[PDB]
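Exercise 3.2. Students should predict the tertiary structure of the chain below and write it as structure tokens, then compare their answer with the key that follows.

Predict this chain's 3D structure.
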Amino acid sequence: GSSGSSGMGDGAVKQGFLYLQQQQTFGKKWRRFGASLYGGSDCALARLELQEGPEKPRRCEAARKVIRLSDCLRVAEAGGEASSPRDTSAFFLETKERLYLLAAPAAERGDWVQAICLLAFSGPSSG
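Answer key:
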């Protein structure tokens, strides 16, 4: 193991760039947002963080977008049929709020869905 000092760094369970379809000026186009998979703890829960590319703090000082995996009511694996570009594999993401259709690379998707489904659907509860 580590005798002297190791140092912090690799924390998130899995890292990868995702694509969330959104609209700003017109039409529905895709937009890359730094995604980070967190979780695997006693108290701390799993959650997906995202980073947008705004211009300036006008309507909101901090423009952050996080989707609590635990919230994911249901998820599926698409074959990249949406507007998304070919040579990829999109996945379904349903949340109490709404349904988000993101796109992922057939390379990562495989693991993504697995991990996500492993965490998001780790320990459900019905209050």
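Discussion points: The longest helix spans residues 106-120. The CA atoms of residues 39 and 46 lie 4 Å apart.
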